[PDB]
Design an enzyme around this catalytic site. Structure first.
Site, PDB file in Angstrom:
ATOM      1  N   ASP A   1       0.798  -1.213   0.000  1.00 48.32           N
ATOM      2  CA  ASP A   1       0.000   0.000   0.000  1.00 48.32           C
ATOM      3  C   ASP A   1       0.840   1.277   0.000  1.00 48.32           C
ATOM      4  O   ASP A   1       1.259   1.783   1.048  1.00 48.32           O
ATOM      5  CB  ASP A   1      -0.945   0.001   1.231  1.00 48.32           C
ATOM      6  CG  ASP A   1      -2.040   1.033   1.188  1.00 48.32           C
ATOM      7  OD1 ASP A   1      -1.974   1.976   0.354  1.00 48.32           O
ATOM      8  OD2 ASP A   1      -3.003   0.905   1.991  1.00 48.32           O
ATOM      9  N   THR A   2       1.105   1.792  -1.221  1.00 50.50           N
ATOM     10  CA  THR A   2       1.909   3.003  -1.323  1.00 50.50           C
ATOM     11  C   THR A   2       1.231   4.242  -0.748  1.00 50.50           C
ATOM     12  O   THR A   2       1.901   5.261  -0.469  1.00 50.50           O
ATOM     13  CB  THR A   2       2.320   3.284  -2.791  1.00 50.50           C
ATOM     14  OG1 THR A   2       1.151   3.365  -3.614  1.00 50.50           O
ATOM     15  CG2 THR A   2       3.211   2.141  -3.246  1.00 50.50           C
ATOM     16  N   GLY A   3      -0.086   4.147  -0.582  1.00 51.32           N
ATOM     17  CA  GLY A   3      -0.837   5.249   0.025  1.00 51.32           C
ATOM     18  C   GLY A   3      -0.879   5.210   1.531  1.00 51.32           C
ATOM     19  O   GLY A   3      -1.504   6.065   2.165  1.00 51.32           O
TER      20      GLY A   3
HETATM   21  C1  LIG Z   1     -12.869   1.479  -3.505  1.00 54.99           C
HETATM   22  O1  LIG Z   1     -11.793   2.392  -3.521  1.00 54.99           O
HETATM   23  C2  LIG Z   1     -11.210   2.709  -2.334  1.00 54.99           C
HETATM   24  C3  LIG Z   1     -11.587   2.229  -1.081  1.00 54.99           C
HETATM   25  C4  LIG Z   1     -10.869   2.620   0.056  1.00 54.99           C
HETATM   26  C5  LIG Z   1      -9.777   3.465  -0.044  1.00 54.99           C
HETATM   27  S1  LIG Z   1      -8.728   3.866   1.321  1.00 54.99           S
HETATM   28  O2  LIG Z   1      -8.294   5.269   1.215  1.00 54.99           O
HETATM   29  O3  LIG Z   1      -9.494   3.532   2.565  1.00 54.99           O
HETATM   30  N1  LIG Z   1      -7.420   2.868   1.252  1.00 54.99           N
HETATM   31  C6  LIG Z   1      -7.692   1.474   1.156  1.00 54.99           C
HETATM   32  C7  LIG Z   1      -6.592   0.616   1.788  1.00 54.99           C
HETATM   33  C8  LIG Z   1      -6.591   0.700   3.298  1.00 54.99           C
HETATM   34  C9  LIG Z   1      -7.406  -0.539   3.723  1.00 54.99           C
HETATM   35  C10 LIG Z   1      -7.468  -1.381   2.476  1.00 54.99           C
HETATM   36  O4  LIG Z   1      -7.872  -2.524   2.308  1.00 54.99           O
HETATM   37  N2  LIG Z   1      -6.984  -0.756   1.463  1.00 54.99           N
HETATM   38  C11 LIG Z   1      -6.244   3.341   0.550  1.00 54.99           C
HETATM   39  C12 LIG Z   1      -5.055   3.576   1.487  1.00 54.99           C
HETATM   40  O5  LIG Z   1      -3.861   3.604   0.730  1.00 54.99           O
HETATM   41  C13 LIG Z   1      -5.184   4.805   2.382  1.00 54.99           C
HETATM   42  C14 LIG Z   1      -5.157   6.157   1.656  1.00 54.99           C
HETATM   43  C15 LIG Z   1      -5.391   7.329   2.593  1.00 54.99           C
HETATM   44  C16 LIG Z   1      -6.646   7.563   3.115  1.00 54.99           C
HETATM   45  C17 LIG Z   1      -6.843   8.620   3.997  1.00 54.99           C
HETATM   46  C18 LIG Z   1      -5.793   9.447   4.382  1.00 54.99           C
HETATM   47  C19 LIG Z   1      -4.534   9.193   3.845  1.00 54.99           C
HETATM   48  C20 LIG Z   1      -4.334   8.188   2.897  1.00 54.99           C
HETATM   49  N3  LIG Z   1      -4.196   4.795   3.434  1.00 54.99           N
HETATM   50  C21 LIG Z   1      -4.349   4.493   4.724  1.00 54.99           C
HETATM   51  O6  LIG Z   1      -5.402   4.138   5.219  1.00 54.99           O
HETATM   52  O7  LIG Z   1      -3.192   4.618   5.458  1.00 54.99           O
HETATM   53  C22 LIG Z   1      -3.338   4.455   6.866  1.00 54.99           C
HETATM   54  C23 LIG Z   1      -3.964   5.708   7.460  1.00 54.99           C
HETATM   55  C24 LIG Z   1      -2.814   6.641   7.836  1.00 54.99           C
HETATM   56  C25 LIG Z   1      -2.727   7.878   6.921  1.00 54.99           C
HETATM   57  C26 LIG Z   1      -1.645   7.534   5.891  1.00 54.99           C
HETATM   58  O8  LIG Z   1      -1.014   6.360   6.344  1.00 54.99           O
HETATM   59  C27 LIG Z   1      -1.535   5.895   7.592  1.00 54.99           C
HETATM   60  C28 LIG Z   1      -1.949   4.441   7.524  1.00 54.99           C
HETATM   61  C29 LIG Z   1      -9.491   3.996  -1.276  1.00 54.99           C
HETATM   62  C30 LIG Z   1     -10.228   3.696  -2.396  1.00 54.99           C
END
Ligand SMILES: COc1ccc(S(=O)(=O)N(C[C@H]2CCC(=O)N2)C[C@@H](O)[C@H](Cc2ccccc2)NC(=O)O[C@@H]2C[C@@H]3CCO[C@@H]3C2)cc1
Ligand SMILES: [Cl-]
Ligand SMILES: [Cl-]
Ligand code: NA
Lengths: 99, 99
Positions: free
Chosen positions: B25-27
């Site tokens: 998960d690059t995000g």
């Molecule tokens: C159907 O399409 C989507 C559904 C969900 C998401 S998501 O943003 O919830 N997420 C999904 C990941 C997390 C759970 C999973 O199964 N897949 C994308 C993530 O990359 C997300 C992207 C993200 C969402 C909200 C804020 C910042 C980044 N990052 C994230 O949750 O990172 C966690 C929270 C903390 C902030 C950054 O890093 C820390 C760890 C995106 C599109």
């Protein structure tokens, strides 16, 4: 390009005539953009992750320019804390994870 | 390897002598794993995802294998929908995004 991951992989995108900053996110199924207007039809959707679900509007067949590459796909619009480019559009620009 | 994104980039990890599935998960800034037992003391952390903020337990200097690559570093434990490998550990295994 080859993007390292020491920092968040943010790129400039053009969507709906607007420039925005967005995260290249392999962990996202779909592209999710902060509230904005897009043309044509949409349908409501719920998407979930850490902290739970948000309601979004799903727009299909939207053109986006991603770091200079045009792609077409689904864009979800809603109260996301960060703009996210998800796998549905990353595939179209040939993005891969390498190690 | 070179991982395309037409399907979710799921890999096997090993933590605590246990094999688990996790999403690259690059995000994600940090690595977040579902409820499990880990050794030592933990510290509190709040992380904010798509749906809001949650409390997680932070365990430092944990040995984790990711897709056969060894890493040692911080693991957050809490109610994540899926085990996610964030940039902290992707950098340790030398992962980059390429297009
Ligand atoms: C159907 O399409 C989507 C559904 C969900 C998401 S998501 O943003 O919830 N997420 C999904 C990941 C997390 C759970 C999973 O199964 N897949 C994308 C993530 O990359 C997300 C992207 C993200 C969402 C909200 C804020 C910042 C980044 N990052 C994230 O949750 O990172 C966690 C929270 C903390 C902030 C950054 O890093 C820390 C760890 C995106 C599109
Ligand atoms: Cl979802
Ligand atoms: Cl391909
Ligand atoms: Na459309």
């Amino acid at each position: 390009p080859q993007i390292t991951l020491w920092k968040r992989p943010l790129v400039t995108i053009k969507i709906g005539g607007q420039l925005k900053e967005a995260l290249l996110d392999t962990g996202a199924d779909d592209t999710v953009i902060e509230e904005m207007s897009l043309p044509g039809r949409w349908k409501p959707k719920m998407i979930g992750g850490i902290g739970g679900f948000i309601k979004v509007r799903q727009y299909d067949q939207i053109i986006i320019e991603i770091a200079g590459h045009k792609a077409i796909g689904t864009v979800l619009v809603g109260p996301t804390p960060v703009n996210i480019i998800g796998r549905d559009l990353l595939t179209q620009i040939g993005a891969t994870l390498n190690f």
